[PDB]
Amino acid sequence: AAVHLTLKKIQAPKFSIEHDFSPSDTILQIKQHLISEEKASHISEIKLLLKGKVLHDNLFLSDLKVTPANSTITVMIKPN
Amino acid sequence: AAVHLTLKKIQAPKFSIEHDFSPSDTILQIKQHLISEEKASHISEIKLLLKGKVLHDNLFLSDLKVTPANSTITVMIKPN
Known part of the structure; x- marks a missing residue:
């Protein structure tokens, strides 16, 4: 019942942080976690991807x- | 003896193309393939990543x- 992810920002300022999420959580919750960790200011600025596919807010x-080989989410942040 | 990859550019102009590479090929060869396919003009402009890690030119x-779950390379292209 845990989805453990690495969240890795790939353009400066970069970061790599980890967290255990609930399977029932949405991608919005990952974004909110990034705001909580002071890695972004606004949800609308954050784009998450896995294997080059954009992960939209409503996705569970x-x-x-995710598998042992890759449970890393790529983080991009761009102004609105 | 084949390494089959998807090469996915995630900022506009985006693309997703596939190719079978040799295990002995370098990351430079992936970049050269992108130039060959008219997806970039210069090697120095191309950044490749997998799971958020930068793949440097000399890497084999x-x-x-790579696994069945993810054999997708994220492509970024930025001027010099």
């Missing part, structure tokens, strides 16, 4: 295709 | 941690 973490 | 494709 239980729908992420 | 046999050192990539």
